[PDB]
């Protein structure tokens, strides 16, 4: 109920002089870790590398980070924008491939990017009626109370649903979108074509709190998935212990609240227990960027729910600073 076996810990060693190994290998200075044309879904899925990108919000960044996705270094909210996230998923996926694992959105990355996939970046989808009934919410407030009265803290729009939907931020779902209205059942909308099916090795998990990464490792050492990651609380460092995954819990209801060896001093205890507090931790999502710990770790719904499907209970967590 406590136990890791040394090959564990060995293994989980291993992977975590990787991560630091790649962490010192990161460009902060590349423009695609910085924040600040034609997005229709034919320039979007046709985005040509070139030189001096640059930051901002390009139909370029918004097609890499499709590519990301599906090559398992998941971007976070589809935004076309550069920033740290980018950054680190860049960084993930030239690791994952024989690259230096710069972040640098270079040629070399960006052809090698282009090659893994086989479909194009975005595609045509059609709003639907199960899509316009929800069922819907019309706030979360953010009282405790006001919540725990509803049948459920759903989601609050059409746009909202879809975005998470196809792993896309919202207002940039509506920017290459602009004439949709999210009202009308049959009409069509540009989507990204992601589909981020991970592989059923996966053996051990870090949360890499300063990268503020979330890493799949396998049993070969490779990493093979990533995720952007808040991890724990600021102003605290993150558990120094190993933690093994028990459960995945889906549509779950949150708590808020403001053999048998008998005694004596030769038990393996002796004969007081003073009783510490105990902490619970999890992989979790989040919830509308606008609602809102040491030890949770914090995703967005899609990449937990994509890890919900393969991880076994059985493999081991570790965090690392």
């Given at each position: 109920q406590t136990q890791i076996t040394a090959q564990e810990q060995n293994d989980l060693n291993r992977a975590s002089t990787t991560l630091q190994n790649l962490q010192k290998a990161e460009?902060?200075?590349?423009?695609?870790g910085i924040a600040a044309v034609s997005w229709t879904l034919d320039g979007l899925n046709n985005a040509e590398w070139y030189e001096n990108i640059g930051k901002g919000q390009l139909p370029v960044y918004a097609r890499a980070h499709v590519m990301l996705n599906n090559a398992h270094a998941s971007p976070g909210a589809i935004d076309g924008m550069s920033g740290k996230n980018t950054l680190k998923a860049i960084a993930s996926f030239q690791q994952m491939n024989g690259?230096?694992?710069?972040?640098e959105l270079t040629k070399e990355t960006w052809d090698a990017l282009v090659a893994k996939?086989?479909?194009?970046?975005f595609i045509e989808y059609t709003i639907t009626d199960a899509d316009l009934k929800?069922?819907?919410?019309?706030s979360i407030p953010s009282d405790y109370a006001l919540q725990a009265k509803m049948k459920g803290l759903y989601y609050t729009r059409v746009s909202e649903m879809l975005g998470e939907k196809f792993h896309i931020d919202e207002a940039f779902l509506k920017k290459i979108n602009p004439?949709?209205?999210?009202?009308?059942?049959?009409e069509k909308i540009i989507v990204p074509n992601v589909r981020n099916d991970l592989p059923e090795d996966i053996h051990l998990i870090i949360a890499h709190k300063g990268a503020k990464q979330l890493y799949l490792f396998n049993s070969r050492n490779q990493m093979i998935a990533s995720f952007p990651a808040t991890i724990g609380s600021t102003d605290t460092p993150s558990p120094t212990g190993t933690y093994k995954v028990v459960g995945v819990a889906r549509n779950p209801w949150y708590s808020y609240s403001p053999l048998s060896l008998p005694p004596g001093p030769n038990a393996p205890v002796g004969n007081i227990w003073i009783g510490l507090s105990k902490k619970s931790f999890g992989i979790h999502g989040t919830p509308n960027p606008s609602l809102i710990s040491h030890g949770c770790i914090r995703l967005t719904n899609w990449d937990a729910n994509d890890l919900g499907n393969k991880v076994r209970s059985g493999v081991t967590v570790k965090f690392l600073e």
């Open positions: 460009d902060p200075n590349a423009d695609s690259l230096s694992p710069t972040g996939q086989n479909k194009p970046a929800g069922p819907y919410a019309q004439t949709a209205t999210f009202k009308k059942v049959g």
